[PDB]
Amino acid sequence: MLKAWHLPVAPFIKEQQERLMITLWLSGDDLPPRVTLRAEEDNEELSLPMHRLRQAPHPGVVAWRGEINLVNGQPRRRYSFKLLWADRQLWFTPQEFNRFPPARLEQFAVDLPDSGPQWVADQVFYQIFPDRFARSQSREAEQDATYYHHAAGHDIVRKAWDEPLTAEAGGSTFYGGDLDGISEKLPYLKQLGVTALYLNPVFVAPSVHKYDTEDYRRVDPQFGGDAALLRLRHNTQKEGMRLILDGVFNHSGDSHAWFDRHQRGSGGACHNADSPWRDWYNFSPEGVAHDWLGYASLPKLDYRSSTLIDEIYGGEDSVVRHWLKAPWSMDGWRLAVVHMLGEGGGARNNLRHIAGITQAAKLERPDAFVFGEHFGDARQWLQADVEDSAMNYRGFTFPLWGFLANTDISYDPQKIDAQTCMAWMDNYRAGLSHQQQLRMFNQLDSHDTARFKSLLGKDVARLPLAVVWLFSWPGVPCIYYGDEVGVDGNNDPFCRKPFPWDPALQDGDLLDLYKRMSKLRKAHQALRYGGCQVIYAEDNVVVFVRVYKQQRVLVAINRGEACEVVIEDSPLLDVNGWQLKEGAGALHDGVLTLPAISASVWFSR
Amino acid sequence: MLKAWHLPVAPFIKEQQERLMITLWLSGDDLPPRVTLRAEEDNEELSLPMHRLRQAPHPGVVAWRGEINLVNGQPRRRYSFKLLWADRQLWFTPQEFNRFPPARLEQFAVDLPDSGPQWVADQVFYQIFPDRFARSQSREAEQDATYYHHAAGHDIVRKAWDEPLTAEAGGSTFYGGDLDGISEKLPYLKQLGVTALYLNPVFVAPSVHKYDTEDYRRVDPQFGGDAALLRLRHNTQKEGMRLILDGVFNHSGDSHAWFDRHQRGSGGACHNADSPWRDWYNFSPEGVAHDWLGYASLPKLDYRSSTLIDEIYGGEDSVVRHWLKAPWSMDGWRLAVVHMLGEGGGARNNLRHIAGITQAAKLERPDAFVFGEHFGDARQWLQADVEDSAMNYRGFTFPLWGFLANTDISYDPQKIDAQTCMAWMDNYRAGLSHQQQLRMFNQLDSHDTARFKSLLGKDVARLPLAVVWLFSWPGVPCIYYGDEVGVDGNNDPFCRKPFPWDPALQDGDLLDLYKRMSKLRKAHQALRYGGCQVIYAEDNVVVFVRVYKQQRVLVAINRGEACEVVIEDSPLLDVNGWQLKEGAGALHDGVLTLPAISASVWFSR
């Protein structure tokens, strides 16, 4: 019966003289005579009175306003609305109306003052698995050589760029991409709209993926060494691009001097009880060192050790800070396996240690961006503010895998409609403040998944829909290298093909779409800072609007046959008019005419 | 269509040779050909296969079984069930079926090994506001005297036991109850079924409630001093009773030597910049010391200070440990204002400090029980395991206030039916492991609320329903002193009447009900350890079953007119028969015949 609107952004909120003004919109025939702003100060629940505004913001809509005092309390301002009649109450939340009180951690929330990395919302990221992206022209003879991969039991193998990928020696096959290759491709990346790089590991390590860290203080010479990473840092700085390295601190590689399984230097932890780093690893009674999910090449680090803590993040000279200060001056860290890191061979005290890693990073570099790898549900980590963001597999990737590709994290069959997809995406982000939502690291696939283009199988025509959605859902988008020219393949090792630089092997129409979406995101504040209201979500169609001050961006996605959808009048959609910017959809008199398998974007004028 | 059953208790779980066996029950015509046990190890999501059991546990029910490996991982074992068909999936959770994956922190969960205070589940608590419970026979002439309450601006006032309570000098009126009075009433309390006491503050402080702590190391002489608390500790130990003190560590009183607002000893923080405890408090620019919600008598403690940390919980001699070791040997702490405690004048770093307080307590006393005062949503605190339990206002008290008394935390009108009430209670506890659920500190009212009997107003006939429910919902029940003989009154100050020892002023039928419910809880393992499945929840009727091994306890509550309710066949209810233990309800051939305004309890035979 009753209708309500609120988003944690202007025009609904406004900061004014140490006060956060909060406005709620209501419409209906049985309007509550009172409305309480339920807010919070230092975790104490507050009942703040709201007053009816004289001016109707839109026809048939009543506005209520309250104020959060900003001089006291913690920066994250949580709130919801308690509608009050003579005999009853009803809550309005990020997940519509609730008959019983919402969870404290599923309210609306705004971070004021926001101390997070505010530049993230303005970025378009691009993830590069360096061995497979680009070989520098002044390439490597000594770094196209071979050596013995102890953990693998044999020599690494070299392959030419057009040699097909095989399941054989997946961690030991090198196509020879390097960091100067990335530098040389910055014009391509700038042309794509990319403003920021996330690199898979680049420190000294024997494998091709290099999560088996051997030296945390040196860049692998295979990728061009320290010199080539200094050049990449310079070249991205010159082009105004951000640069994030992969930080692998849950475990080291078993060839690291601290562990030294293959006794390259008398042995650290594995074959020495008096080793200096003996207590940096955990050894069972049964003789198996604790490792990452049973991979002996990845011995887990024991953060009970106060010397290890100092080495990774506690000290001024710690690894986390080393790469964030000059000459390196990286922009932050992607935290590999952020969720298992801890003490005693497991995740004991994990949240404290992640909080310490992030704190150490911001100490060296206040605007550093620290986000964690979360295949699972990151909400406990983000709700405790131990990191800025997560790889948003649960809140973005897997909803799209189910709705568009009928599959999921385990490649189990999925059958979810638009209702369920959007309930899923909105439930997840209800756990996050607006500022957190805007910096969630969103991607369609990664070096640890099958390529989304392949997951679509016979429904590959849906791929452009996911691209539009990637650039218009709250979060910072990350392109996985090659996705934009149509690279496909199954999961690891097959998701890491060498990038096809031959334009004959490139999907140019897909490339152009990525370019156009990056321009729209760069152009429109609501696509970077806006709130997000799902307007319509039924069967094959999702419609949502991004909202920022007076601006609106309407997005309509239709995964199935051509159809028409009626959009009820909404005060969020009450604009002078709409300009179609991308896609073939059409809007007229509240009727969306949506072609089959299409995504469309309108800007309000 | 499909039906599913699972509770985190036998017969559904069983520990066997470092393995947790997990069984799921399914029934229906379109049963999934595969079921995945979604589990977790060191926060990594696991896909464990389940196999169909040959033996049907009950007619028409299929059983699936999986195993969690217990040798690795953290003690809290989280899991849910992923039902798999050829084209689709469906999740089974504590909140029934979900079409998208449940939250990590809303799964089933079992703590194995359980390091919490396992004795709590066996208790019946009784909360005593000491000034208002009982005056010792060898009473106090010097402690029936008067003195100057600086923070109040006048002398404390003394009142005779039958003098009515008034809003005047609510914090400064003393009826003279003391600790030896409690000792002398232990036979009454043992007769009631009480096995454990929670005392409001008893340390030296000028007010009657004594949350304005002046000396953390001494018992107030008004209550009989250190000697009388030693006697109470002895007498409860003799009677096999547990004893919990109120720990007020978010703030001190402003008369404490550390603060010393009234310069009783040259002044600590308030009137001295070189004070030893200057940095134990926070002073604004504007001249107002930071305090508890604007009460100058309660200056907030600044846990940034490393000396304060050592004094409260860090040191061997710290306040938290002092009262847990001999000669005091208390059984734990109720943490006042647990949610605001922190650094800098607010809740900054709250979770770390509460975790430290609990850790210090368990260091002194491994089975200590630490639970926090949570008027609001305690789930973030409990999900991070920073305390054992909470005063369960959000999960128990306020659901009953709405469903039975049409009101809520703010005394705002509520209109919720059985559906909403039970959705509320089950949603809250879905955030908690079974072991956490069993030790949630449940009560109908407190020294900080109106008496539930008064809140019921014209619906006071519903009071016995709340009593039955208090003893049969998962959690440890706490009787608020006088509730059991029918004491009423509005909120603070009027909720703290002197206990009516004259039997003419006592509701004896209500007393007897409390006695009988305590006997049933003591008698039946499912009322102390059992899982809990809501069987029926519509309009005025709530039916739930507690489940433990082969035993069942069925509870049916009807807040309205007499009615009949059909209970569908349930494999949880498939027993040899039912013995009615309390109430006038009747069960026959799946038909519950429930009198008006009634609660009934059956034991399976």
Ligand SMILES: C[C@H]1O[C@H](O[C@H]2[C@H](O)[C@@H](O)[C@@H](O)O[C@@H]2CO)[C@H](O)[C@@H](O)[C@H]1N[C@H]1C=C(CO)[C@@H](O)[C@H](O)[C@H]1O
């Ligand atoms: C062993 C494992 O090592 C890396 O996996 C890492 C992830 O890529 C990364 O995102 C990080 O957060 O944590 C992981 C551990 O450090 C390699 O990239 C992976 O290729 C993986 N290699 C294994 C891959 C398997 C199946 O993909 C496995 O069966 C192979 O033996 C290994 O090569």
Ligand SMILES: C[C@H]1O[C@H](O[C@H]2[C@H](O)[C@@H](O)[C@@H](O)O[C@@H]2CO)[C@H](O)[C@@H](O)[C@H]1N[C@H]1C=C(CO)[C@@H](O)[C@H](O)[C@H]1O
């Ligand atoms: C000022 C305040 O002090 C105590 O309140 C405490 C709670 O009882 C207790 O549960 C704890 O966790 O935290 C509170 C602060 O320490 C007294 O018990 C209360 O009576 C309260 N006294 C005030 C009561 C008010 C309304 O009830 C207030 O308007 C009076 O001036 C005060 O007496």
